[PDB]
Structure 1
């Protein structure tokens, strides 16, 4: 059973701006997704201080970067707090509305797309490099879900029947045909070192076979 939802008009507008604007410095998408993963990890770690049982779904706090050339995907996996169904449909988008308006105003005043994370809507930079984004997520208080959007104004949510993740979030970037440099080990290594070198969780860059 697949549910289809419309983005808020303001978020659709943000996504079209990201897709349509000419802007060569696309690599910052990775910093933004890793930053989100670090925030999610910080959150479950803080909650576990007063309720250790929140780590019964997995003690390890880490980020994995997994390229796959056959599928032309780059996956950013974390074992952070995860997202509930309400997070996926409502909560994050509610919070994103104000960040989007501020980001739009900053751009008109001379900011650039690389500053998107300073407004709390860095996730949508994924559409600098991906034609489709799939998000698999599992929060301790909810079931495992799959969210997906190719932009165009809509997204879907369904219960996920794939491999159980335990707890956390996988962001699967279905890369655009001209963005496959982000599958290469040396390129990902370079970007992590430049923009994410002090993240307080181990980042493991998987190798392809």
Structure 2
């Protein structure tokens, strides 16, 4: 880690948070935009040589939430990043003084609408998350992890698990108790619909599906064991004459949002 980066990013985070705490939900517009840019870079190269896709022929954005772990993930099958691209790019942020432009914008009553164009849109994740773990894999390198904290502290290292992404970037956000509503189905759907206006690539959301049916009491007990479902809720009854139960089978599935 660099001291210049820790000072700049603290400022970027401070200004972005101070300006957009009433519009916190715009971090998703930025991450979808970044994902779309990473996809266009690998899509553009595939027109010259379709061998860049390799085993990963999917060109899309995937949004999923882990309500238990309080994590929201934004994955894309884009170009991905090399250790060099990551270190060099973080180096340009540190010595650019974009925070100065933003400070001046904020003090003048301007909006944070240029954070994307400036290349600092990523730091908007700190409006809703106190830690951001980026998993990335580019054809020309190994899979790396880039962890970022709300105190401008970061770390870059090789993924022990290996190339679990094949190609692209995964952005995991450890949400603040302050912004847990972003793990909700209705909220994410509303936000994705809103922020996927000029997006050329498909966006998929992993959301809950419920399959309800009447089952004979003895079979209902066996259905709890079905591992093809995340959970199986079986009706409780104090009535010993009841030969049947209402069973709710819950499984998360991918739905195209655009």
2:77 aligns with 79
2:129 aligns with 130
- 1:1-209 matched pairs, under 5 angstroms: 4-6=1-3, 7=5, 9-19=7-17, 23-94=21-92, 97=96, 99-162=98-161, 164-208=164-208, 209=252
> Contact conserved, 1:182 with 1:188, CA < 8 A, in 2?
yes
Structure with larger RCO (C-alpha < 8 A, sep 6+): 1
- SS of alignment partner, residue 35 of structure 2: helix
What is the rounded CA distance, in whole Å, between the counterparts of 1:8 and 1:87 in structure 2? 19
> Contact conserved, 2:19 with 2:112, CA < 8 A, in 1?
no
2:220 aligns with none
Q: Quick check: which has more Rg, 1 or 2?
A: 2
Greater per-residue strand proportion: 2
TM-score, with length taken from structure 2:
0.73
- SS of alignment partner, residue 18 of structure 1: helix
Query: Aligned-pair distance for 1:74?
Result: 0.4
- What's the Cα RMSD here? 2.1
Deviations 1:62-89, CA, capped at 9 Å, x for gaps: 0000111011010000000101112222
The alignment covers a number of residue pairs equal to 206
- SS of alignment partner, residue 136 of structure 1: strand
Deviations 1:103-155, CA, capped at 9 Å, x for gaps: 33322222223542232211010000001000000011111000101132320
What is the rounded CA distance, in whole Å, between the counterparts of 2:85 and 2:150 in structure 1? 18
TM-score, with length taken from structure 1:
0.89
CA distance 1:94–1:153, shift in 2 (3 Å): same
CA distance 1:66–1:109, shift in 2 (3 Å): same
Query: Aligned-pair distance for 1:30?
Result: 0.2
What is the rounded CA distance, in whole Å, between the counterparts of 1:142 and 1:100 in structure 2? 31
Greater per-residue helix proportion: 1
What is the rounded CA distance, in whole Å, between the counterparts of 2:9 and 2:85 in structure 1? 15
What is the rounded CA distance, in whole Å, between the counterparts of 2:20 and 2:52 in structure 1? 44
> Contact conserved, 2:60 with 2:76, CA < 8 A, in 1?
yes
Task: Give the gaps of 5 or more residues in structure 1.
Answer: none
